[PDB]
């Protein structure tokens, strides 16, 4: 089969989870777009971040998504 | 005797040793935090 | 203490500039102590040395 516009995968991520230890971790989490706080001024040094992260795929071919969507 | 001081007014900043130790952690801080950042971009880059 | 005077024992502050200079609240407290030492008395229990 190669319809790959018809293809979709959802698949819920494994559970990730970060310890904050220096201003570096936080300064490359904010330097991530998809990386969003409610509160922008909340203090991450010292504390433990878990992602638990749900993924859409559509695929163009068998090796290249057309969208990738995370949240 | 005499005493020539060529120090250049490093004398009057207070806190000598705790100013230069600031100085030199913010430019490690942004250096690190720069590295890291570019680094990451670039990960996300090629994962992409 | 006369005012603008130097106490022959006082203790020195040292001022931002990096100097040591006679200080009076550490000159009148160190004074006070040896007042209270001399009157009272001072103790040194629990104080090893």
């Given at each position: 089969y190669t319809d790959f516009e018809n293809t979709f995968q959802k698949t819920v991520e494994p559970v990730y989870q970060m310890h904050i230890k220096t201003s570096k971790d936080i300064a490359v989490l904010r330097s991530k777009?998809?990386?969003?706080?409610?509160?922008?001024?909340?203090?991450?040094?010292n504390k433990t971040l878990t992602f638990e992260t749900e993924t859409e795929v559509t695929f163009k071919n068998a090796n290249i998504f057309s969208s990738v969507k995370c949240f | 005797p005499v005493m020539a001081d060529?120090?250049?007014?490093?004398?009057?900043?207070?806190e000598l040793k705790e100013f230069t130790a600031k100085l030199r952690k913010e430019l490690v801080e942004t250096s690190e935090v720069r590295k890291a950042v570019s680094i990451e971009t670039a990960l996300e880059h090629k994962v992409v | 203490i006369p005012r603008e005077t130097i106490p022959f024992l006082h203790l020195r502050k040292k001022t931002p500039a990096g100097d040591w200079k006679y200080d009076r609240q550490l000159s009148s407290l160190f004074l006070d102590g040896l007042e209270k030492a001399a009157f009272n008395g001072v103790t040194f229990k629990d104080k090893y040395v």
């Open positions: 777009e998809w990386f969003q706080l409610d509160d922008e001024d909340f203090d991450l040094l | 060529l120090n250049g007014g490093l004398q009057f900043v207070p | -």
